[PDB]
RNA sequence: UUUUUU
RNA sequence: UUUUUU
RNA sequence: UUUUUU
RNA sequence: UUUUUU
């Protein structure tokens, strides 16, 4: 028998199971007021711990589907969240004024309703819900890194989007305690992330300012924790008209097993379809078989070759056991790409004067690229020094 | 007659027998409160010695099957546990408030009910049961090694999972007396281990934080006490397009009998199907015929060749009678793989300048690998020195 | 024998294994209430 | 993010 | 576990 | 008996 | 009579 099929058992599910998750959709007549009080209860730091998915789904249905609930129920968002296990029950209250009136009579909701009794809500318009969802979308690139990287990329996008002047956020939203709260809100809730990823891909026509902000930040979330996929598919597995060809640094007999297992675990990622870019942010299925520790030499060689082409990839951190092979593959790819561009300049130049012009241009191009790579490595070194200074501050 | 069939008698069962094990499934209306008091009685150190399988199965049915017991009864978990001998009887109590009311009237349950009279339970939510099962899943890689290795890998995974911020465990769960208790709970109970292995393989869609933690730790449990299977199938029995070919260190006439008996006892392991990775952790059938002492030279040569490819396998311990042949096979495979990569570099390089680039790269690659192998050997030497210091401390 | 794809035999395999588990749990239910009916008739015969 | 001129 | 840039 | 790493 | 190891 084929004894090498033992290594592939226990991988792929043979009888797939989902767990039911009951999520409460609120339906009043004063729906914009209920959604603005859910926004104010989230901004106040009040932990609404079981009604979080229900409050965020009330906000998202009221923004994108106009709180209709039959347009929402037949949408592909609701088909996806039904297949992922969620069950929507719509509780109704025809004369409900405040969010305090709408909470059920379970006894663990008592600290929530005594917190919501003393909470002051400001009267606000229809355009606060799209402002809140656009602010929650800014944390989606570098969500899977951590809280510091998300807050830094979020404040950089606040300055970019206010430099266009199209939005303004209030100044207590940009305090880092409040941004820490909104990071934990987006990290702990699956359906807000999926609704923002879906409506960033698919709501494309007739744009508001808020919907263009959400689509811009969702377009930067693509392969957010899947750098090894972009580096291997762009540089190792080379695409040409003959087919797929390996790199010369990976054609020996000790890394070809790792590229075979990477091809297999890669083709199980495209089973997710159009959310396969968004696989680590949504925590999908096959992302445990795309870790760096499963493929140490392939990740280090691929990051070295990708650093040798794009100069801004020298600021990624990596583990200590991968840095030195990464630097060796970087130096080998700089010499190999220099030999290739010299031979192509000899191919395409039709006279020696043109050949001298092209050789001076491509020499100056590589010197510019090398100076940019040293500048971004020094930026990484004082960035880690400022981080360790903040470590020894506390 | 074939007299060499005498060596294969008494191996495989000819009339297979199972023993009935009666396990008590509790069914109240206040099921989350009963399961949280079972969690609090496990955390307190109270030995609930006959109701352990019943309490853990009550927790697992209430988490994964929503305490439905007709969804559970027709699941493949219950078919597997019926074929493995367990019999479920569901006792019912429609108005049962505490776990004290639900214990039967056997006289050996008297120290349990006097311990449960004075036990204080804290009111807690639905999300404590998944937290407890996710904490019990962290001990599953390196379960079959021992208690120190399980607690060390568990605390490393606590720091990894809290560095993502997705969970927090209370600080008295991370005391090593409490982790020693939870190790003995998971080690002494078959059905908690199997339910976590099944739901780590098969619950894959629409993930919670807890279910992704359980699937991550079950994906590291694959071949947990079956290192000889991974080393022999990856390096000795070489897979290529022509077929299976032996390694040059094992093609003589004294190790070929051991690889024939390893092929036979290996093909009886894949009779277990999709739990054949999980064979030592679940204590399945053919794992006594995969011991290192049955195949001393094949295990030492396979571990040497696997150390010569992957540099982190120099930190495995082995017995004293296998270390020296392992070091000889390691040195022979370093020289053999160096000769092969030199011949393949001569094959794939199209010019001598490219050949000099590739020879400098692959030389630097082997020097990096050799320095990492000496670093992990020195890590093993002060790890065993710290262990013997703890031996002479007591 | 009766499927056409691997997806079709995966759906039919999941159906017939759930159907066999349904009839086995029903058979055990009938056996337990048969045992309790015989025990109650013997308790009435001992009472009478 | 965009960046000139008419 | 993840790590850049836009 | 098992022994690494992720 | 049997004699190791796992």
Short mmCIF file of C-alpha atoms in Angstrom, two decimals, chain B residues 95 101 116 164-165 177 196 198 208 249 267 269 271 277 299 302-303 316 356 393:
data_model
loop_
_atom_site.label_atom_id
_atom_site.label_comp_id
_atom_site.label_asym_id
_atom_site.label_seq_id
_atom_site.Cartn_x
_atom_site.Cartn_y
_atom_site.Cartn_z
CA UNK B 95 -35.87 20.56 38.71
CA UNK B 101 -28.69 17.17 43.78
CA UNK B 116 -19.60 19.41 47.15
CA UNK B 164 -2.82 37.59 19.98
CA UNK B 165 -5.09 38.84 22.76
CA UNK B 177 -0.29 22.70 40.84
CA UNK B 196 -11.07 17.24 21.40
CA UNK B 198 -12.51 14.85 16.63
CA UNK B 208 -14.85 31.04 17.64
CA UNK B 249 22.77 3.74 4.66
CA UNK B 267 0.70 -0.80 7.33
CA UNK B 269 -1.19 1.43 11.74
CA UNK B 271 -5.89 0.30 9.58
CA UNK B 277 -1.77 10.19 13.56
CA UNK B 299 15.49 4.40 14.63
CA UNK B 302 16.53 7.58 10.68
CA UNK B 303 16.99 10.11 13.48
CA UNK B 316 15.41 15.12 20.85
CA UNK B 356 29.99 30.53 -8.51
CA UNK B 393 17.34 20.04 44.79
#
